[PDB]
Structure 1
Amino acid sequence: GAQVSTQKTGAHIHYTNINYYKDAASNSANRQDFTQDPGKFTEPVKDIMIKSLPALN
């Protein structure tokens, strides 16, 4: 039950992982979660605002 994942590499390879314990709080940190969604804190308006259009008309 081995997991093969990709390593952090430069721009312009794999590693193997096996879990030994039974609790899942014993596992290693999730360092490869690169999900973003800034539209909650930024631009949180009810009506959408187009960039080229005047904010108030």
Structure 2
Amino acid sequence: GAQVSTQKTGAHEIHYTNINYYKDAASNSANRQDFTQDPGKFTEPVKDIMVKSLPALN
């Protein structure tokens, strides 16, 4: 029941092993490898979107 995933290494130059030991999901370690984002709801939060080269309020 082991899971293998890559480590946080640098660029231009791994594979740790994890087994869960407790019956509950509140015992698991922190999910410190989710690096995704989406600033489309804070920047650009408008109807009838803008095309960045048009005068846009033309």
TM class, shorter-length: over 0.9
Per the alignment, in what secondary structure is the counterpart of residue 16 of structure 1?
strand
Gaps of 5+ in 2: none
CA RMSD of aligned residues (A): 0.6
Q: Secondary structure at the match of 1:25?
A: helix
Q: Which residue of 2 aligns with 1:39?
A: 40
Q: How many residues align?
A: 57
> Would you identify which runs of 4 or more consecutive aligned residues in structure 1 move more than 6 Å?
none
Larger helix share, 1 or 2: 2
CA distance in 1, matches of 2:39, 2:32: 19
Question: Structure 2: how far apart are the matches of 1:32 and 1:2?
Answer: 18
Alignment TM-score, normalising by the size of structure 2: 0.94
% identical equivalent positions: 98
Q: Measure, in 1, the Cα distance between the counterparts of 2:40 and 2:47.
A: 12
